[PDB]
Amino acid sequence: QTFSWVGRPLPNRKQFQQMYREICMKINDGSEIHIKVGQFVLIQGEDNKKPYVAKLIELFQNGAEVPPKKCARVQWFVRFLEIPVSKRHLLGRSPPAQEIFWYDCSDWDNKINVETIIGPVQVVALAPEEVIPVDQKSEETLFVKLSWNKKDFAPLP
Incomplete structure (x- = not known):
């Protein structure tokens, strides 16, 4: 697949970097995914595993790499099974695959x-009361109720 910037560079005073609002991913079957x-987005991991999930917070052309690269800054999410086995019990329940x-x-x-x-993925913020359907295979939509900080789970603010 190939990537191309959409739109003009955003205003800023960053040296050797150009920021953009949007990118176009042209995939093998010819589709152009904005x-x-x-x-x-789903991000490729080490080939044995499920893709990582992240929120895109910045897109930028990085000129301080050679050859230059298209990059993103992200806010990471973590799947339950990406959390160390010894700490997972702290959730106090078994979450569905979509959480x-x-x-x-x-x-x-x-x-x-x-x-x-x-590619993109839909992620939806939920209150703790809300019910995720718990028998489902599809991960077209993922849901988030809590944060994890390496120590414990906390409700989102």
Whole structure:
């Protein structure tokens, strides 16, 4: 697949970087998939595993790499099984496959190469009372109720 910027560079005073609102991912079957800042994406992992989930917070052309690269800054989410086995019990319940967690930690480098993006995903914020359908296979829509900070789960504000 190939990527191209959509629109003009956004205003800023960053040296050697150009920021954009939107990118166009042209995939193998010919489709042109538009992804905007603020949307969520699936990100390719180590090939044995489910893709990571992240919110796009910035898109930028990075000239301080050679050759230059199209990049994104993201807000990470984490899937239940991406949380260490020894800490998962702290949730106090077994979440459905569709539930993910806002990753509240600066640990994971938040800059990625756009070439690692698989595509968009819908993510919906829920109140704790709300019910996720719990027998479902499809992950077309993921849901988030809580954050995880490496220590414990906390409700989103």
